[PDB]
Ligand binder design. Structure first.
Ligand SMILES: CCCCCCCC/C=C\CCCCCCCC(=O)OC[C@H](COP(=O)(O)OCC[N+](C)(C)C)OC(=O)CCCCCCC/C=C\CCCCCCCC
Ligand SMILES: *[C@@H]1O[C@H](CO)[C@@H](O[C@@H]2O[C@H](CO)[C@@H](O)[C@H](O)[C@H]2NC(C)=O)[C@H](O)[C@H]1NC(C)=O
Ligand SMILES: *[C@@H]1O[C@H](CO)[C@@H](O[C@@H]2O[C@H](CO)[C@@H](O)[C@H](O)[C@H]2NC(C)=O)[C@H](O)[C@H]1NC(C)=O
Lengths: 397, 81, 52, 154, 61
């Protein structure tokens, strides 16, 4: 679908796809390589059988590319889009099968050599929600995985419901933030930080709880292990450069609540040349604050710009169909409960537990998107415009 | 113009008439297990308060909403100071 | 004579500042050019008027 | 009262899994304190850790899920373990229901700077063991807001 | 003011006077902060650190 006029340019059909199959779309090669065609890969997996297949197509013309995808004999579990590229500027894609072997694509000689030289720096994490298990596997030289780390959230009291990790295609402009005082506070930009959110299997209105763990993706260290009491799902979490924001229901007072977790390091950065998840002995400090949202929610996703210069906004998807553009600066956890000279220097609004849903903030005016399912945000060009596609029953751009 | 919602268990629920043409103020409704049930104005802060509103909800609209924001269009008198 | 000389002395700078104010209103909200040297952050409130 | 949890370590040239018993953790649920009682390294273990450090291998820790129903494990750069004079901290994270969730091991200081280390250094285990229960997140603050707005109105 | 050789010394005194003004300028900086001496003014100069360990995946497909 052309993003400007909304017309349809090409349609294709995948024969024999079950309704409950799980998909995963990856842009393997963009259009900045004119001598080579753009190429995308779609990964389907029938739930009943378990067999998964890969369909590779040109995303511009819609015809299947002549590059034959490999026949995935074993059922697969997870996929990775490594930033390393082949000679034809195709991003390497990795699949982990059921026998925990690794299949590459395009898996040419150059790709195999490149990822064999870079093997020990590639980690998979598989979150088995049925058993409440999390595993993290290395990548050996000969394309095999070993049990690097393993955690178990007991399913008898907690089931994993969301594993939202930070988007790979984003950049952070300001590593730190000005605190006033002529000093700087450094954000804890960890690129391998999961945000696994679990619900309490106890459905009683008074004993239910919702846990959020900021599990690292490489070393398995639990950065944060928050557990909110007297709360019930569904929970909608967005994970961004530094912060995480997860909306939930509060059973005790019957009101939807936000809870912003901001990760901050010390006044001086531990290391600036490079970041390694194996070399972070200082647990980042966590700043939390809970706000009241006066309505329900259906989908969230932060607005993303190419260089991250533009401020961040959350696209709250209300049941009414509107798309509220809540400024992230409002959800700062450092907003003091009593204003001080430091806050005035930093221009921090005093803490207000109520978040307004003023109708002038909606990014759509009356094109309500009934039964909203998700919000996709694309960086686009420029620096102030982020493309928004709210998909559900209706589809709006 | 009236409305009826069925299959409601006992508790507290915020009722809102969503309509893109004209907004409607939400109203909280507390229904008990015995059967008596009441309406009031929602207040997510200090929820213990009670501001009774008649049960046959007369949720009169407040005109069309204000999704749009008018252009600035500053004048020379604005440039003066 | 005092009023005339004061007005003449005033008209050497004040028109420039009034033109600057008119330009600031008329062309508010843009990013026009990049100054090729790294100015200090404390100079932000006056270089970037009209930008959030 | 007190429950004992096994704790194994592993480090090899091929970076495979050869977990061997290292220490017992006495987690007393009443007062919420955890103490470890490990045996010091031997000559062959010290040598093996030396080659693992040379090849930039990994030092993996693993504990049983229950006091053989499963295991929870993690790893740390073993060369960073030897370049920190065997000074490390393992934190045991559990959940609200008092079930073992995970073990996280990290050295002090982290990373590596090419510091050559003599054998005599590796005869002590400077391990700081902590237990981290889930920290309750704060709810929204309403009393302060209502009192402040009442003062504003008056 | 070159009536004699003392002009040279007078010049130094003049420089001293200028130095006095320069000293006041420093005070003005202390009264305004318009000088790139703190680390905060260096914030825009910090390039983002490169990622060393790559980790992807998520819920079971
Ligand atoms: C139609 C569009 C108008 C055409 C352009 C207007 C011509 C202005 C030329 C001009 O004669 O103006 C230049 C003066 C110079 O300054 P001056 O005070 O030394 O000479 C003025 C002596 N006096 C103070 C006694 C007047 O500067 C000024 O006033 C510039 C005034 C700035 C206002 C911009 C007008 C906005 C458009 C409408
Ligand atoms: C920051 O982390 C890196 C990675 O652990 C440390 O190691 C440096 O890594 C770079 C990139 O490969 C090399 O060029 C350097 O030679 C490495 N340094 C050493 C001493 O081996 C790096 O030292 C860390 N920075 C600081 C200041 O500790
Ligand atoms: C044993 O490990 C502890 C860490 O648990 C070390 O304590 C640290 O010591 C350094 C300086 O020696 C301080 O900068 C850190 O703040 C300390 N950490 C904590 C948590 O207090 C201790 O030094 C180690 N002992 C030896 C002999 O190496």
């Amino acid at each position: 679908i052309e993003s400007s006029s909304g017309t349809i340019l090409w349609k294709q059909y995948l024969p024999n796809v079950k309704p409950d199959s799980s998909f995963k779309l990856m842009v393997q090669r963009t259009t900045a390589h004119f001598p080579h065609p753009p190429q995308c890969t779609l990964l389907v997996k029938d739930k009943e059988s378990g067999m998964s297949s890969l369909y590779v197509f040109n995303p511009i013309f819609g015809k299947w590319s002549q590059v034959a995808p490999p026949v995935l004999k074993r059922p697969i579990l997870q996929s990775l889009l490594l930033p390393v590229m082949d000679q034809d500027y195709a991003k390497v894609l990795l699949l982990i099968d059921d026998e925990y072997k690794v299949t590459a694509f395009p898996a040419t000689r150059n790709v195999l050599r490149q990822l064999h030289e870079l093997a020990p720096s590639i980690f998979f994490y598989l979150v088995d929600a049925e058993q409440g298990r999390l595993c993290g596997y290395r990548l050996r030289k000969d394309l095999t995985t070993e049990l690097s780390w393993e955690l178990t959230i007991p399913p008898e009291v907690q089931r994993i419901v969301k594993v939202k990790g930070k988007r790979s295609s984003e950049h952070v402009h300001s590593q730190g933030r000005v605190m006033g005082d002529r000093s700087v506070l450094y954000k804890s930009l960890n690129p391998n930080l999961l945000a696994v959110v679990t619900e309490s299997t106890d459905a009683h209105h008074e004993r239910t709880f919702i846990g959020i763990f900021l599990i690292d993706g490489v070393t398995g260290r639990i950065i944060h292990s928050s557990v909110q009491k007297k709360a019930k799902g569904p929970v909608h979490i967005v994970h961004s450069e530094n912060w995480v924001v997860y909306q939930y229901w509060n059973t005790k007072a019957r009101r939807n609540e936000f809870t912003v977790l901001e990760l901050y390091e010390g006044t001086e950065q531990y290391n600036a040349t490079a970041f390694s998840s194996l070399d972070r002995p200082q647990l980042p400090q966590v700043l939390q604050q809970s706000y009241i949202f006066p309505s329900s929610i259906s989908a969230m996703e932060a607005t993303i710009t190419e260089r991250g210069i533009t401020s961040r906004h959350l696209l709250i998807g209300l049941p009414s169909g509107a798309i509220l553009s809540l400024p992230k600066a409002l959800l700062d956890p450092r907003r003091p409960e009593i204003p001080t000279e430091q806050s005035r220097e930093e221009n921090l609004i005093p803490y207000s537990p109520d978040v307004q849903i003023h109708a002038e903030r909606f990014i759509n005016y009356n094109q309500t998107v009934s039964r909203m399912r998700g919000i996709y945000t694309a960086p686009s060009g420029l620096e102030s415009t982020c493309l928004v596609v709210a998909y559900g029953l209706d589809i709006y751009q | 113009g009236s409305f009826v919602v069925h299959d409601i268990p006992s508790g507290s629920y915020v009722v809102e008439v969503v309509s893109p043409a004209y907004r409607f103020d939400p109203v909280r409704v507390d229904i008990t297990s015995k059967g008596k049930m009441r309406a009031r104005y929602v207040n997510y802060i200090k929820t213990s308060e009670v501001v009774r509103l008649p049960y046959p909800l007369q949720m009169k609209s407040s005109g069309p909403p204000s999704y749009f924001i008018k252009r600035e269009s500053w004048g020379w008198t604005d440039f003066l100071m | 004579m005092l009023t005339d000389m004061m007005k003449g002395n005033v008209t050497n700078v004040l028109p420039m500042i009034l033109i600057g104010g008119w330009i600031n209103m008329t062309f508010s909200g843009f990013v026009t050019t990049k100054v090729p040297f790294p100015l200090t952050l404390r100079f932000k409130p006056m270089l970037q008027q009209g930008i959030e | 009262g007190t429950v004992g949890l096994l704790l194994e370590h592993s480090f090899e040239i091929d970076d495979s899994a050869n977990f061997r018993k290292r220490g017992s953790l006495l987690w007393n649920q009443q007062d919420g304190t955890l103490s470890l009682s490990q045996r010091q390294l031997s000559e062959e273990e010290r040598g093996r850790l030396r080659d693992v450090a040379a090849l930039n291998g990994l030092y993996r820790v693993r504990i049983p899920r229950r006091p053989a129903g499963g295991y929870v494990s993690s790893f740390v750069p073993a060369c960073s373990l030897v370049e920190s004079h065997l000074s490390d901290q393992l934190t045991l994270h559990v959940d609200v229901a008092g079930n073992v969730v995970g073990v996280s091991v990290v050295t002090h200081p982290g990373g590596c700077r090419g510091h050559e280390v003599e054998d005599v250094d590796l005869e002590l285990f400077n391990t700081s063991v902590q237990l981290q229960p889930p920290t309750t997140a704060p709810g929204p603050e309403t009393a302060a807001f209502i009192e402040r707005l009442e003062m504003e109105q008056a | 003011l070159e009536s004699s050789s003392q002009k040279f010394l007078q010049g130094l005194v003049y420089l001293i006077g200028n130095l006095m003004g320069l000293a006041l300028a420093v005070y003005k900086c202390q009264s305004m902060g318009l000088l790139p001496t703190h680390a905060s003014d260096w914030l825009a100069f910090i390039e983002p650190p490169e990622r060393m360990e790559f980790s992807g995946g998520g819920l079971l497909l």
